[PDB]
C-alpha cells in the first residue's frame, strides 16, 4: 500500500490513523526533509473533516502530543 492511500476513516480515531501513518512512513526510505514535508502535509490532508477542523485551530508549530490530545473526543 502507498503512503497517499493512507487516510482517516469517518469513525476512526486519529490515533489509530497516526499509527498507520508512521508505520507506512517507516516503509518509506526518502530524504528526511521530504519525510518532514510528508508529515506536515499529508497527515492533516487525509485526516477526517471533524478532526481536520480541530487541527486547523491548533495552527502551525504544533507537536504530536498536542495533536493527539487535540483530536481525542472526535
Amino acid at each position: 500500500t502507498s503512503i497517499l492511500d493512507i487516510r482517516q476513516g469517518p469513525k476512526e480515531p486519529f490515533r489509530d490513523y497516526v499509527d498507520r501513518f508512521y508505520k507506512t512512513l517507516r516503509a518509506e526510505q526518502a530524504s528526511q526533509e521530504v519525510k518532514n514535508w510528508m508529515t506536515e502535509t499529508l497527515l492533516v490532508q487525509n485526516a477526517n473533516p471533524d478532526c481536520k477542523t480541530i487541527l486547523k485551530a491548533l495552527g502551525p508549530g504544533a507537536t504530536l502530543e498536542e495533536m493527539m490530545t487535540a483530536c481525542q473526543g472526535v
Binding site: 490515533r15 497516526v18 499509527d19 498507520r20 501513518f21 508512521y22 508505520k23 512512513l25 517507516r26 507537536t63 504530536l64 502530543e65 493527539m68 490530545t69
Partner: protein, 147 residues
C-alpha cells in the same frame, strides 16, 4: 555493550539473542506500563547508543509513540547542542573530539568512537545522557497513554 573482561580491561561484547527477545517480549506484553522503565534500565546496563538505537529500531507496533519518542530524542539532542557549545579552536592531535547531541544519539558517532569516550580517562557517560532522554520521553508517553 561494553563490559569488563577477565584480564581487567573494558572491551565491547555483543548483546545476547534471549536478551534481545526479552526486550521484545516486555514490549509485547506490558506495552506502555511503568514497569517497562526499570526493566529497560536493567537491560540497558553497560549499553551503547548504538545498542539503544538497535533496541528502538527493532520495535514493532505503537508507531505513534515511537515517533513521539524520536522527536523527544531529537529535542533533547538539540538541547544538548544548545547547552554545550563547540569548544575553542581546532581539535588537538593528542585528544579526541567532544560529542554533540547526534553523537549521543549514536547517529554521527562510530562504535570505536563510542568506546573511546566511555573507556578513556576521564570517561564521559553518553549512555546515561541518552538514558535520561529515553526515561524522560518514557514519562511523556506513560502520561499520555494513561486513560
Amino acid at each position: 555493550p561494553i563490559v569488563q573482561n577477565l584480564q581487567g580491561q573494558m572491551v565491547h561484547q555483543a548483546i545476547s539473542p534471549r536478551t534481545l527477545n526479552a526486550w521484545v517480549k516486555v514490549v509485547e506484553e506490558k506495552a506502555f506500563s511503568p514497569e517497562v522503565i526499570p526493566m529497560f534500565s536493567a537491560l540497558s546496563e553497560g549499553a551503547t547508543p548504538q545498542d539503544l538505537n538497535t533496541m528502538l529500531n527493532t520495535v514493532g507496533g505503537h508507531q505513534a509513540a515511537m515517533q513521539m519518542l524520536k522527536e523527544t530524542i531529537n529535542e533533547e539532542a538539540a538541547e544538548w547542542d544548545r547547552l554545550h557549545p563547540v569548544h575553542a579552536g581546532p581539535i588537538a592531535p593528542g585528544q579526541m573530539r567532544e560529542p554533540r547531541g547526534s553523537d549521543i544519539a549514536g547517529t554521527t558517532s562510530t562504535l570505536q568512537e563510542q568506546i573511546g569516550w566511555m573507556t578513556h580517562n576521564p570517561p564521559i557517560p553518553v549512555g546515561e545522557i541518552y538514558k535520561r532522554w529515553i526515561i524522560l520521553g518514557l514519562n511523556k508517553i506513560v502520561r499520555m497513554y494513561s486513560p
